[PDB]
Amino acid sequence: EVQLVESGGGVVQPGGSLRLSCAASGFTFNSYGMHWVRQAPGKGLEWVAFIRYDGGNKYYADSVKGRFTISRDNSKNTLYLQMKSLRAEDTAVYYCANLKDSRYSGSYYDYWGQGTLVTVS
Amino acid sequence: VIWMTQSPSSLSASVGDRVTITCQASQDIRFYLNWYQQKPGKAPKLLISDASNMETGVPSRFSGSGSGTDFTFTISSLQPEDIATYYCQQYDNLPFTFGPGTKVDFK
Amino acid sequence: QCVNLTTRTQLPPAYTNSFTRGVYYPDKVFRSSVLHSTQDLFLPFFSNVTWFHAIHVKRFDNPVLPFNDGVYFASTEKSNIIRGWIFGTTLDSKTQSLLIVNNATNVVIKVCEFQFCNDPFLGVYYHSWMESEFRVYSSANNCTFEYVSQPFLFKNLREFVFKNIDGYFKIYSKHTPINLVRDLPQGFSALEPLVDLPIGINITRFQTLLALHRSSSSGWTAGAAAYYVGYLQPRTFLLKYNENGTITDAVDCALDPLSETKCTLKSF
Ligand SMILES: *[C@@H]1O[C@H](CO)[C@@H](O[C@@H]2O[C@H](CO)[C@@H](O[C@@H]3O[C@H](CO)[C@@H](O)[C@H](O)[C@@H]3O)[C@H](O)[C@H]2NC(C)=O)[C@H](O)[C@H]1NC(C)=O
Ligand SMILES: *[C@@H]1O[C@H](CO)[C@@H](O[C@@H]2O[C@H](CO)[C@@H](O)[C@H](O)[C@H]2NC(C)=O)[C@H](O)[C@H]1NC(C)=O
Ligand SMILES: *[C@@H]1O[C@H](CO)[C@@H](O)[C@H](O)[C@H]1NC(C)=O
Ligand SMILES: *[C@@H]1O[C@H](CO)[C@@H](O)[C@H](O)[C@H]1NC(C)=O
Ligand SMILES: *[C@@H]1O[C@H](CO)[C@@H](O)[C@H](O)[C@H]1NC(C)=O
Ligand SMILES: *[C@@H]1O[C@H](CO)[C@@H](O)[C@H](O)[C@H]1NC(C)=O
């Protein structure tokens, strides 16, 4: 029933920008916080950003802080990630996820999308 | 920011072997650690939450334990379908972090 | 002994309109014939409230939900299937958890290191009647808080608001008649304060406890059960107090430009 679908990937130049989105369905999206996680080819998982259920408080990894912006539209069940000043090092598969978390988001279930590839070159 | 490391970075084992993976935090994260299993081309699957709680649907051969800085993930009887890269992740505080990832290969 | 009730897959969500419900008295202060502007955690007007069918008609699906910054809970039943709630974080023996259970004569509230079942429920037997909490948890230790009082719980519509601020778990509630089905009624009704519990624990997740009758998991049956869950947000409200200090109306200042104007001018 639960689906998360990333889109908006593609190939961009260094110093450019790209806006990703994730369409959520099958669960009450507006009740959960959401995360972005990226995985560069040949590398492990890297946490990127987190936004609370109300779209208020936002948190970022130090490596993207000041460049990336996280947002959500709860009337469209869509999660967004706006990336500015992209670098070659940002090449990765980007996932939207609902990570099980007993401390912050309160999620009791773990959901992941399919992953959208972003290439910077 | 809390640092996460895992050891060994890679191990090989045969079917029926016991496999242990160590995850260590640079700071005391109590019992707030997740374990994920990722196979090539797929998103990570959660197996264990809160250090030792098993997710519904996860085979009883999987287990884990630990508290503070030193945590262990164990497979009591490795199956041919357990060949994957395992990650530990802390959610004691933001930003959240994942470990390097431990690859379990087939002997 | 814990049994496996949730043997079916998870059902998709349904939603209803909150209209103008979920407003509670923000404090214990008497005001009258006055429009008072207050900033607190309130349920947004005309928002989408999730409608759960924990027991669908014998499909048992009673999920653990996030608590966020507070929860609006409502139900309409005459079967007395909903008995209580569990609030906590890990919901296991590692942390303190809050267990609120209602029965025929009282309400019992305990905070202990409960080791809860995967899909906990209250066991009801008929011989005289017998009731057991060991279908909710296997064991509990290191209890820090205990409170006992009178029961918290056409058709009767029961509404609750749960907050957890600065160590205090605050419960508000209202009981009204309803002649509608499959939705929430229109109109305004403020929720009066019920109890302030000096507990001092973290709450991030919660679950609703249902009573099942012994008449292993296949031996437990109950009639259909459903409830509504919404979440509170930091909102500014203009509350209208009548001459007796009862709130008769309210404006959600962020609902629209018209409401913003009313809140600015302090007028309905
Ligand atoms: C309930 O949730 C709150 C909020 O997350 C928890 O508060 C946090 O507790 C940790 C552990 O004590 C604090 O970390 C420590 O901070 C001090 C500096 O104040 C530092 O010297 C220590 O080395 C350590 O990093 C954390 O800062 C604190 N967060 C906030 C916002 O105060 C609280 O512990 C939770 N309650 C329970 C029972 O878990
Ligand atoms: C409903 O809850 C009340 C409160 O826990 C139960 O009353 C208690 O019963 C125990 C066991 O006999 C006594 O030791 C307590 O002193 C009683 N407390 C109070 C306030 O009466 C009551 O038995 C429960 N009802 C049923 C059917 O179990
Ligand atoms: C519930 O399922 C578990 C397996 O996940 C099993 O070990 C347990 O015995 C079952 N409970 C009952 C009453 O059969
Ligand atoms: C509530 O959900 C409906 C879809 O069923 C949507 O059209 C409407 O805009 C939503 N309202 C709010 C406040 O989210
Ligand atoms: C009971 O809980 C308190 C608060 O967390 C803790 O300090 C105390 O050590 C616990 N007692 C036992 C026996 O676990
Ligand atoms: C206020 O209380 C009086 C009784 O003292 C009652 O007659 C009157 O109808 C009440 N008015 C409202 C608006 O509740």
Residue numbers in the entry:
A (entry chain H): 1 to 121
B (entry chain L): 1 to 107
C (entry chain A): 14 to 70, 77 to 146, 151 to 176, 186 to 247, 254 to 306
Task: Provide passages from the article that reported this PDB entry.
Coronavirus entry is mediated by the trimeric spike glycoprotein (S), which can remain intact or undergo cleavage at the S1/S2 cleavage site, yielding S1 and S2 subunits. The S1 subunit engages specific receptors, leading to conformational changes that trigger membrane fusion mediated by the S2 subunit. Activation of the S2 fusion machinery leads to exposure and proteolysis of the S2’ cleavage site situated immediately upstream of the fusion peptide (FP) and large-scale conformational changes from the prefusion conformation to the post-fusion conformation. Except for mouse hepatitis virus (MHV), most coronaviruses use their C-terminal domain (CTD, or domain B) of the S1 subunit as receptor binding domains (RBD), adopting either “down” or “up” conformations, the latter state enabling receptor engagement.
Unexpectedly, S2L20-CVR, which recognizes an NTD epitope (site iv), promoted robust entry, challenging the previous hypothesis that NTD-recognizing antibodies are insufficient to induce SARS-CoV-2 membrane fusion and entry without ACE2. To gain further insights into how this might occur, we determined a CryoEM structure of the S2L20 Fab bound to SARS-CoV-2 Wuhan-Hu-1 S ectodomain with stabilizing HexaPro mutations. Relative to closed S2L20-bound spike structures, the open S2L20-bound spike structure exhibits a repositioning of the NTDs and bound S2L20 along with stabilization of a conformation of the N234 glycan that would be sterically incompatible with subsequent RBD closing. We hypothesized that the N370 glycan might sterically interfere with S2L20 binding due to its proximity to the NTD-bound S2L20 Fab fragment. Consistently, the T372A mutation in the RaTG13 or BANAL-20-52 spike, abolishing the N370 glycosylation, significantly enhanced S2L20-CVR mediated entry.
